[PDB]
Design a protein around this ligand. Sequence first.
Ligand SMILES: O=c1[nH]c(N2CCOCC2)nc(N[C@@H]2CCCNC2)c1-c1nc2ccccc2s1
Length: 289
Amino acid sequence: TRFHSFSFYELKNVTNNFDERPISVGGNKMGEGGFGVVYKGYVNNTTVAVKKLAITTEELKQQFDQEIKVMAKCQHENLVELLGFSSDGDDLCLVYVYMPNGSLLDRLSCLDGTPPLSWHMRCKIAQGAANGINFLHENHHIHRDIKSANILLDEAFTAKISDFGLARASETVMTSRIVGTTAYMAPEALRGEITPKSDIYSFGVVLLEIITGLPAVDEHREPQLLLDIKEEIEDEEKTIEDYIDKKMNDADSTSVEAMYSVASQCLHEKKNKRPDIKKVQQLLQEMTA
Ligand SMILES: O=c1[nH]c(N2CCOCC2)nc(N[C@@H]2CCCNC2)c1-c1nc2ccccc2s1
């Protein structure tokens, strides 16, 4: 698949000169951290998300080329759709289909007054995100940064996996440049190993965030790291019912326990004991069915 080459000045013009101001006051900024800032824009009769990239300038160009490579090979309903790019101007830009419901992290934290996600919507999001990871693993790609901030939500709250800049083709390797988000990383990924089993572990943390509505890491909380609740529950001090997000009215114990069981299996500290993505996908389908 081939993409449209956008002019930097067209992207600069539709995003109000890449405004740092947010949604309310009159700017276009939609979020940052994923090695760039995402801005809202309107191009060729469509609402778009324009990611202006902003380690080394060469490493940032490597991730720009990697994102296009992965997106050229990988088209799926549970991956964000790349509409084009821009290399001509000062800053590297990636253009996507606009995701009106932001990220799963934003929606789990009810950022900007949005209503809490229902258990019914959370199940669809978990299944959709697992279908997106399955498609990546089937095409021998390792995401390397699976987290709720990288699961975007469209007009129908369909889960769309994003950020393929750090993605690696497999088609267990070792690396000197350890990348990803600490609170979601498998022990072997924190040591430099590159394997699709690390994406399964990170997805297990995403499933706990979905059940609990709690962020993967919170400086003002005990445990500070969400993955530690797996041990508090296993060493029967608590149960998953004590951790269910109170901001839901439709969560039943049976399906929550079925999602928690998938998460627990994903979070096995030994990479070879974790289920593969097809098994995770099967278990999430049986939970609903
Ligand atoms: O299209 C988008 N809309 C919004 N909304 C729209 C509604 O108002 C709030 C902002 N947020 C986005 N991402 C950020 C990511 C960081 C955390 N917060 C959300 C995207 C995309 N972000 C990306 C990122 C990579 C690839 C494609 C896309 S599309």
